[PDB]
């Protein structure tokens, strides 16, 4: 249940089901970027494989010259998609009481538009955590959960 | 699309504009006929409407 | 994070109940439900963040009730040997109407009208035709009142027995507000949906009052889900149907006076014809004064406010859930 | 008066003659009175 | 602050700061007088036809209508003002509709009143809102904070406030005057700041009949419109028709045609005696140096002028004592007569001389 | 925007044109240690007042002297700013009328008001500015126009002073005599008939003469024409008309104009400030003709107004 | 020697309060007096005292007292200091608050000026807003890791920041911080922002507030919707948000024409608003229990009430009742298990207007203390509910008063139902069922009680009867509420030339600064204690004379059952219900407990007429 999620679920795979409020215009991550550095004129490339939203790889710092020179060329560059869906629990039950509470979602390229809002969804994910910015405190830090990979209902429609 | 109204709930009965509240812009609302196209509509009380 | 507020029963007189901030850890999280006096035993604590380099003059710190525990007000499930018990009361023939007179106590009520009440909340079957429609499984209750009759108070006894069961008043609102709406947050977050006395209520009892008060827009919304069995919402983007398979229970209140003709019911009260047709139960509540029904009621009303066979409560709201399931 | 007074300005007078007056009034009476036709 | 010009503030109102800006001292505030003019003063209250006098002074332009001009000069001296021993205030206030043909001068006497009175103010009908006459708690701008302004009849406390088209005016406006109009003062409880604060001011307001020749008989009482309670709540209610006297028109035409000459205004009304700016100093001082009773002369007469006329409500009563003492305020009489009720009655009864038809 | 820098002239209808307040160009300050005097030239929107000294007495001192401002010996000039829409008739036939600032110093403040037809000459110049910081590619200029010489179309009665060798002007018309007449029937020649109701409009346009009673009070002091009567007869091309020949003239409809349209609404004004009145109608056009049609439409709020 | 004045002035105040401070001879209170005052405080420890002015500013002549008014913020702390001499010589955990009253003079807040800043004031006006109580450092234990901490002392005058010097050590400095949360004294505080007094403001300016500070265990003195009397201890607060205000406005920029060139600028605006302080606040604003004996006593005192409730007004004899049965409550208690009885009562007058149904009103407002005067139409919506106020800053959730629920276990006035429309009229009902005040805003959800009774006054539908119209129809405010107002008392005046007279007669009278001479057998001050002492009772009915009432009941509904054309109503059984409350009230009034049958009897008769007005 979305309603219950201990913090001993944190990064292991839990699946839940619930209903799609919003997903959100996609952005673009890169898994290759091929780097510059200016003063230097050296050149390299950074390719990440995998990432959650960490943010998991910055350019490096260092090509005097210095601090880090190091100019993204964009066009020999390659991209993918992210879209961040956002789930929120079934209207329907059980809260009763109080406005139902709802996670964030993140899911990259194959994964994405999959999935129009409303149709009531079950995903497997990764529980997880990111820093944001308090809206908290002290310390807290707010869940997300990581998407791989997610299965519809069927059809509903 | 079974529509019974008047429209319902939330759902108005026809074609509408509505604004996205974020981006300003504007979009199709949604309703029977729209969200139904290229098929059948149910509608009852076709009088109340 | 729990927002406490100071019990407004024993507030002395013309202060206001002040809001005083909870926080909660491990175990103890999620245990607490809104709604319900609840106790806990803290450290309090001056803390924190704190900087509050903003506040400056004079120089404050903000406190907190760091909470160690929780103490319930001041949960219910059948069991093998309670339901074992239990197996052997239900056989006699006359628990139907022990169990009716049991149903409303306080009121002294009707034979009738409480039968109603009690038919209408025990149950239905509901009952899917392969594979194609389910009928209705339920019975909605059409209680016709009568000004100074006690055709509220009824149905609120439901809202206390029933295990899923909720009051949406007529409007205006006592939240929730009977339409299903997806609507802007508090405070600043992003939009959630919410549905109405209907969808919160599904399988359980959905408890309305005068209908006669209600703006069409919700009257739309009503006749829909006795209709389909089913809310369906297309704004903004989020496009659904909802399922509420709630039994209704109404109160309502005549046109003007207690009879207000010997015209017929339908004549008798504003509601239309075709909604009132949805309701099987109609419940209709008199009378002209009577000397004996006077006596029988004054002595009862006279009873309660000096103050100051049916089977235990506890057992029946039990009796209602173990059958239904 | 504040007819006649305007219609004199137009030969800017400060004199105010019975013709402007009387024209006044010919404009007033044939406003309406136009409602016999 | 003080002019000579416009007409001079009460003392009761001012108050404190009289009884404060003394301490610190000051200067300026309550308008000082000679002694020579004063003994103008005591002098030409001496002349008989005064009550007469100052009624075709007021408005000069202005023509015939004289017990208009009359009524609305006791509203500028109008009552007396009483605390008991708390609460009490009825104050001085009396209170003037006006109704009648159109084209009939009912919005220049507002002008004039306006301008005469130190602090009214002056609203349209329809160009008003029971938000706009008391408490708007606008955001300052400025500042960037949230201050509270004063209404317009907060404002208009104390002396005039004057009001256009009053039969006009939306069915929830209407409903801030039966809180002025009997309390005296306006309870605000909205929004942020919750109080019942002052506003004591005369309320002169003109109506247009619905005809808007009101015309012969119909009942009256009917015509102005107007809930009747609300009607019958006004001090004095002016209705103001055209008998078309022959013989009259041919008289205004002579006064009203002139201007004409001289192209700079002079002479006016002349010739006619008349005071200009000693009737402001006049009027003033007769405020604040006088504070009338009315003894025991008046009781008998005065009771059974009401009982006349309930043979009508209670308040007419009311504005009977009120209108008449103001009568007594001037002459500078601090007891009433026996006489001079006749007419403070009379004035009641002169619409009625105009309610035959 | 590849004009920016020339000296040109437009043509549009003046709006808004906010307050004139003082600008400063360049600020002095006085040391009063050191004596002399400290002017920093000013730009832009916004400035730092400097402190410490920069007198040359004051400079290698051990000891700089502090200085502050005084606003009596600082060279303001008075600041007008105001926009100008595109005069609608040039506008394509698709689209919107598009706007335009201007500024105003020195002189030429004042001659500028809304409900104008105008054309102004000056000297256009790009100032700094873009959107939302992650708008621009930049650098961009945002733009203005600079305000060196007003010239009005439809000029401006009653004020002149002369009546120098103009009167020769007039008299062309003069001369001729039966004015009356001829100007009657020169209102909105393009019309057939009805003489009369044009030999009156001539008189609506005159007006006068009012009055003061000295006290005083004031009667008008103009003329308030009706023009019934229907379907055809061409009424309201006589109201397009005047409001093309009377200056302040304004032409409204009643659904047309809404009350809030007619009576002033508070606003935050831009720039200077704050919360200014800006009416509209009746108040936008006034000293002169306003014209009204569907006059039966207009409902009740409106009536109130006008009555 | 500045050191040296004041400390004289120390001296000489000392010297005071141990010079003998009461000249009361033979029988008293003979001598000291604050010595008893130190050891009474010494008696259950609570470290705080209260000290008289006159006293001290009658001793010295006043060289003494002047020296305290004037320059009191800079006496503070020789005072308190001076206390603590005192009490450490003559008595064996230190925190002590001085507070004086009874001042000679009181100070409108209009006429608060900036020459009589840091000095001690009398201020009195309306509390509005009270804010939840928070700590307050002004002793603190906080320094750097380095090279120790403990150090316990400064952040006196509000800053809040810093160690004042011995830095680090070794690393001596300036640094900064840290502070424990582990050491330190804390006191108090709660915030109130007081309003002038309704009655005094200057036409037309309205009303302004200013904001006063409680710390002290004058602390929750304060009360909601109050009038209060201040003592001064007056200073001032700095202010932000005074820009473009306009200037021309004082800075800090500093000199630094010492030392030498080879900080930067280091320039703060400083830009003050003033806000009172208060060490003392009042709500100011056995031989009388002999009196109230002597009314329990008589037999006639009930018809003493009524005929001296409101000699304002002329007549009526049962609107009065009306009035007065308001302010003496039912048990409004029980009967579980459960829902509880109501408890309270309602009235709702109603006549064609001059009939003075206004008067009434502002009797109450003016006789009854804890009651809310409004004339809505202008509720305008909250008004009768609370906002509720937020932001503070620091948290909110502050609650403002207001209306209705700022009058509580009390009679709230309402002019016109008729105006208000829909909106409010619901939340009404939502008071009058429910009788919880649930609010929830944009932000923290909340529920607030109010248990109150309302009286209104209500204009017919075109001001008049209607007679033959039901009064179901004359009202025109919808069913709910209307079921729940017992019972209406609606007057209507009509032309009787006895009456007629005495009207005329009496309102002249009143109009007449003699004869004033008009006086109710009981005087306004001494029904008030006599009410709350009636109040303290809990009325219970046991006796089976509650049979009768059945029948009583039973007598009312049956000759009203036909013809239905009659007032009905029913008669609902809420009537039943209401007879109860009735009852109790009258035994609220006459003392007695268990009542009679009698006194239900009057109720009785009272609902009738209360009935038959409505026939026709
Ligand atoms: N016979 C009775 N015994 C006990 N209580 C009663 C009886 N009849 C009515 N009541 C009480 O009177 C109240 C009547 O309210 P009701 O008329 O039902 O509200 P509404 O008119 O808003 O629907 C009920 O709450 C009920 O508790
Ligand atoms: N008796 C009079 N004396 C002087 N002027 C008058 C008199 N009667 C009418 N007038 C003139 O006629 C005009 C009256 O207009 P007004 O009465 O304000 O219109 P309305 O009656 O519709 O309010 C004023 O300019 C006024 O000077
Ligand atoms: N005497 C005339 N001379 C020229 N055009 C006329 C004449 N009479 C009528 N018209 C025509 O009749 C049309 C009426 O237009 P308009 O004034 O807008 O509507 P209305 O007929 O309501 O006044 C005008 O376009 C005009 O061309
Ligand atoms: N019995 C009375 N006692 C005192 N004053 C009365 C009485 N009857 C009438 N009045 C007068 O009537 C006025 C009150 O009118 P009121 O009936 O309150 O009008 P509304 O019904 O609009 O409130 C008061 O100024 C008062 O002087």
């Not at chain 1, 993918?80 to 139902?100: A, R, S, T």
């Not at chain 3, 803390?47 to 525990?69: H, Q, R, W």
């Not at chain 3, 059409?142 to 055709?151: E, I, M, N, V």
């Not at chain 7, 107002?485 to 009787?496: A, E, G, H, K, R």
């Amino acid at each position: 249940p979305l309603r219950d999620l201990d913090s001993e679920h944190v990064s292991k795979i839990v699946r839940l089901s619930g209903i799609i409020i919003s997903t959100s215009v996609l952005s673009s991550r890169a898994t290759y970027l091929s780097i510059m550095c200016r003063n230097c004129r050296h050149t390299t490339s950074i390719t990440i494989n995998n990432f959650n939203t960490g943010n998991t790889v910055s350019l490096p710092r260092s090509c005097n010259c210095g601090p880090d020179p190091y100019i993204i060329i964009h066009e020999s560059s390659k991209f993918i998609d992210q879209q961040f869906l956002k789930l929120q629990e079934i209207p329907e039950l059980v809260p009763v009481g109080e406005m139902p509470r709802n996670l964030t979602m993140t899911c990259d390229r194959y994964l994405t538009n999959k999935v129009i809002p409303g149709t009531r969804v079950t995903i497997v994910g990764i529980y997880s955590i990111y820093n944001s910015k308090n809206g908290s405190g002290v310390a807290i830090r707010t869940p997300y959960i990581k998407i791989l990979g997610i299965q519809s209902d069927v059809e509903t429609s | 699309v079974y529509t019974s109204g008047k429209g319902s709930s939330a759902a108005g009965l026809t074609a509408s504009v509505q604004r996205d509240p974020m981006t300003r812009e504007f979009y199709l609302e949604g309703g029977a006929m729209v969200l139904a196209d290229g098929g059948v509509v149910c509608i009852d009380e076709f009088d109340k409407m | 994070r729990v927002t406490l507020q100071e019990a407004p029963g024993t507030v002395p007189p013309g202060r206001l109940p002040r809001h005083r901030e909870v926080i909660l850890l491990a175990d103890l999280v999620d245990v607490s439900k809104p709604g319900e006096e609840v106790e806990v035993t803290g450290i309090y604590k001056n803390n924190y963040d704190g900087n509050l380099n903003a506040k400056n003059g004079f120089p404050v710190f903000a406190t907190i009730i760091e909470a160690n525990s929780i103490k319930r007000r001041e949960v219910f499930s059948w069991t093998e040997e309670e339901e074992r018990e239990f197996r052997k009361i239900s056989r006699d023939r006359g628990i139907i109407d022990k169990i009716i007179s049991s149903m409303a106590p306080s009121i002294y009520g009707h034979r009738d009208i409480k039968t109603a009440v009690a038919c209408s909340l025990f149950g239905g079957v509901p009952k899917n035709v392969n594979g194609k429609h389910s009928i209705r499984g339920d019975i909605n209750v059409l209680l016709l009142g009568d000004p100074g009759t006690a055709k509220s108070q009824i149905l609120k006894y439901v809202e206390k027995t029933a295990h899923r069961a909720v009051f949406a008043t007529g409007q205006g609102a006592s939240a929730v507000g009977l339409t299903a709406s997806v609507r802007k947050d508090p405070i600043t977050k992003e939009w959630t949906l919410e549905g109405g006395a209907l969808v919160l209520a599904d399988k359980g009892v959905c408890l309305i009052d005068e209908f006669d008060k209600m703006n069409d827009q919700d009257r739309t919304s009503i006749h829909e889900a006795m209709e389909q069995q089913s809310i369906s919402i297309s704004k903004a983007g989020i496009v659904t149907t909802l399922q509420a398979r709630c039994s209704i229970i109404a109160a309502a209140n005549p046109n003007g006076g207690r009879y207000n003709s010997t015209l017929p019911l339908a004549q008798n009260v504003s509601l239309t014809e075709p909604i009132l047709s949805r309701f099987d139960i109609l419940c209709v509540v008199r009378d002209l004064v009577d000397e004996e029904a006077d006596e029988r009621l004054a002595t009862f009303v006279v009873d309660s406010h000096v103050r100051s066979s049916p089977i235990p409560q506890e057992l029946l709201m039990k009796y209602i859930h173990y059958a239904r399931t | 008066i504040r007819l006649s007074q305007a219609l004199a300005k137009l030969r800017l007078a400060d004199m105010v003659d019975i013709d402007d007056v009387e024209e006044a009034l010919r404009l007033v009476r044939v406003s309406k009175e136009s409602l016999y036709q | 602050v003080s002019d000579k010009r416009l007409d001079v503030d009460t003392s009761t109102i001012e108050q404190e700061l009289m009884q404060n800006k003394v301490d610190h001292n000051e200067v300026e505030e309550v308008r000082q007088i000679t002694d020579q003019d004063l003994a103008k003063i005591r002098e030409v209250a001496a002349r008989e036809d005064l009550y007469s006098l100052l009624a075709r002074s007021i408005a000069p332009s202005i023509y015939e209508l004289e017990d208009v001009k009359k009524g609305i000069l006791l509203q500028l001296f109008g009552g007396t003002n009483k605390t008991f021993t708390k609460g009490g205030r009825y104050r001085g206030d009396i209170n003037i509709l006006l109704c009648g043909d159109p084209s009939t001068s009912k919005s220049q006497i507002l002008q004039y009143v306006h301008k005469i009175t130190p602090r009214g103010v002056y609203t349209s009908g329809k160009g008003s809102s029971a938000v706009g006459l008391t408490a708007y708690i606008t955001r300052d701008v400025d500042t960037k904070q949230l201050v509270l302004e004063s209404g317009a009849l907060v404002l208009s406390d104390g002396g005039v406030c004057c009001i256009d088209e009053f039969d006009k005016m939306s069915d929830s406006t209407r409903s801030v005057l039966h809180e002025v109009m009997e309390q005296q003062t306006i309870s605000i409880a909205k929004a942020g700041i919750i109080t019942t604060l002052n506003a004591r001011s005369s309320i002169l307001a003109s109506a247009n009949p619905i005809g808007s020749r009101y015309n012969p008989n119909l009942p009256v009482t009917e015509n102005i419109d107007l809930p009747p309670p609300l009607l019958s709540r006004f001090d004095l209610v002016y209705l103001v028709l055209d008998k078309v006297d022959e013989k009259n028109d041919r008289e205004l035409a002579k006064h009203l045609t002139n201007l004409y000459l001289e192209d700079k205004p002079e002479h006016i009304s002349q010739d006619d005696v008349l005071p200009v700016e000693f009737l402001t100093m006049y009027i003033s001082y007769a405020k604040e140096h006088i504070h009338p009773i009315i003894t025991e002369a008046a009781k008998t007469e005065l009771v059974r002028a009401y009982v006349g006329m309930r043979k009508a409500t209670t308040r007419q009563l009311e504005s009977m004592i009120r209108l008449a003492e103001a009568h007594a305020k001037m002459k500078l009489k601090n007891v009433v007569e026996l006489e001079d009720v006749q007419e403070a009655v009379r004035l009641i009864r002169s619409a009625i001389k105009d309610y035959a038809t | 925007g590849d004009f920016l820098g020339q000296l040109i002239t437009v043509r549009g209808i003046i709006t808004r044109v906010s307050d004139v307040k003082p600008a400063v160009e360049v600020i002095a300050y006085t040391c009063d240690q050191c004596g002399y005097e400290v002017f920093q030239e000013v730009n832009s929107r916004t400035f730092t007042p400097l402190s410490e000294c920069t007198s040359e007495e004051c400079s290698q001192n051990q000891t700089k002297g502090q200085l502050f401002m005084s606003t009596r010996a600082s060279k303001f000039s008075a600041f007008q700013e105001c926009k100008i829409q595109e005069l609608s008739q040039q506008v394509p036939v698709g689209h919107i009328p598009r706007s335009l600032n201007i500024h105003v110093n020195g002189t030429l403040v004042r001659s500028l008001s809304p409900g104008d037809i105008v054309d102004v000459t000056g000297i256009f110049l790009p100032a700094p500015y873009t959107g939302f910081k992650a708008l621009k590619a930049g650098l961009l200029t945002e733009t203005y126009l600079e305000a060196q010489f007003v010239r009005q179309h439809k000029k401006k009665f009653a004020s002149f002073s002369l009546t120098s060798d103009v009167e020769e002007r007039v008299m062309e018309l003069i001369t001729s005599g039966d004015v009356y007449n001829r100007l009657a029937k020169s209102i909105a020649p393009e019309i057939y008939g009805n003489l009369d109701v044009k030999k009156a409009l001539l008189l609506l346009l005159v007006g006068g003469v009012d009055k003061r009673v000295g006290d005083g009070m004031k009667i008008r002091g103009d003329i308030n024409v009706c023009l019934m009567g229907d379907p055809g007869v061409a009424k309201s091309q006589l109201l397009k008309a005047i409001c093309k020949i009377s200056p302040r003239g304004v032409y409204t409809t009643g659904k047309g104009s809404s009350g809030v349209g007619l009576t002033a609404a508070v606003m935050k004004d831009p720039v200077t400030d704050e919360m200014i009145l800006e009416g509209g109608a009746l108040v936008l056009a006034d000293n002169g003709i306003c014209c009204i049609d569907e006059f039966d439409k207009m409902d009740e709020s409106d009536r109130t107004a006008i009555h | 020697v500045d050191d040296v004045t004041g400390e004289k002035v120390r001296e000489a105040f000392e010297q005071f309060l141990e010079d003998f401070s009461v000249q009361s001879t033979d029988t008293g209170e003979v001598e000291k007096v604050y010595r008893a005052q130190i050891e009474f405080m010494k008696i259950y420890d609570l470290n705080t005292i209260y000290i008289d002015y006159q006293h001290l500013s009658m001793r010295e002549n006043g060289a003494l007292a002047m020296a305290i008014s004037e320059q009191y913020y800079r006496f503070l702390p020789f005072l308190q200091k001076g206390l603590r001499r005192v009490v450490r010589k003559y008595a064996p955990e230190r925190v002590f608050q001085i507070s004086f009253f009874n001042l000679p003079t009181v100070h409108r807040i209009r006429d608060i000026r900036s020459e009589k800043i840091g000095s001690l004031l009398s201020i009195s006006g309306t509390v509005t807003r009270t804010s939840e109580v928070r700590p307050e450092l002004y002793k603190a234990s906080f320094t750097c890791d380095m090279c120790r901490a403990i150090v316990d002392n400064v952040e006196q005058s509000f800053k809040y920041t810093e160690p004042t010097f011995c830095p680090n050590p070794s690393c001596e400095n300036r640094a900064f911080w840290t502070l424990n949360v582990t050491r330190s004294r804390f006191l108090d505080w709660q915030k109130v922002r007081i309003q002038e007094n309704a009655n005094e403001i200057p036409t037309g300016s309205m009303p302004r507030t200013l904001d006063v500070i409680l710390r002290g265990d004058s602390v929750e003195r304060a009360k909601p919707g109050d009038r209060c009397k201040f003592t001064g201890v007056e200073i001032v607060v700095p202010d932000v948000t005074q820009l473009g205000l306009p200037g021309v406005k004082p800075s800090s920029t500093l000199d630094t024409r010492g030392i030498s060139k080879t900080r930067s600028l280091g320039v703060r605006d400083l830009t003050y608003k003033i806000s009172f302080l208060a060490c003392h606040v009042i709500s100011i604003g056995s031989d009388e229990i002999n009196e109230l004996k002597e009314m329990v006593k008589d037999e006639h005192i009930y018809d003493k009430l009524v005929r001296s409730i409101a000699p304002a007004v002329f007549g009526h004899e049962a609107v009065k009742k009306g009035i007065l049965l308001q302010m003496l409550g039912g048990v409004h208690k029980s009967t579980v298990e459960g829902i509880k009885l109501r408890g309270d009562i309602n009235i709702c007058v109603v006549g064609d207007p001059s009939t003075s149904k206004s008067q009434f009103l502002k009797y109450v407002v003016g006789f009854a203390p804890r009651s809310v005067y409004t004339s809505g139409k202008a509720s305008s919506a909250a008004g009768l509910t609370a906002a509720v106020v937020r932001d503070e800053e620091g948290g909110d959730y502050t609650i403002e008063a207001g209306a209705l629920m700022l009058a509580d276990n009390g009679i709230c006035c309402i002019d016109e139902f008729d105006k208000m429309d829909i909106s409010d009229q619901v939340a009404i009902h939502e008071a009058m069922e429910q009788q919880t005040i649930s609010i929830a805003k944009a932000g923290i959800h909340a529920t607030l009680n109010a248990r109150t009774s309302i009286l209104a006054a209500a204009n017919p539908v075109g001001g008049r009867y209607n007679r033959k119209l039901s009064l179901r129809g004359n009202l025109n405010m919808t069913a709910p509420i209307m079921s729940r107002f017992d019972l209406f008392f609606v007057i209507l005046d009509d032309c009787n030339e006895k009456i007629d007279t005495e009207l005329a007669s009496h309102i002249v009278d009143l109009h007449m600064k003699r004869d004033e001479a008009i006086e109710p057998p009981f005087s306004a001050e001494q029904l008030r204690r006599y009410i709350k002492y009636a109040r303290t009772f809990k009325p219970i009915l046991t006796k089976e004379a509650r049979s009768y009432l059945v029948e009583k009941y039973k007598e009312l509904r049956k000759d009203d059952a036909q013809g239905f054309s009659r007032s009905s109503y029913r008669i609902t059984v809420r009537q039943l219900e209401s007879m109860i409350r009735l009852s109790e009230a009258i035994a609220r009034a006459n003392c007695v407990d268990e009542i009679t049958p009698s006194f239900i009897a009057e109720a009785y008769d009272l609902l009738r007429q209360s009935i038959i007005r409505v026939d026709v």
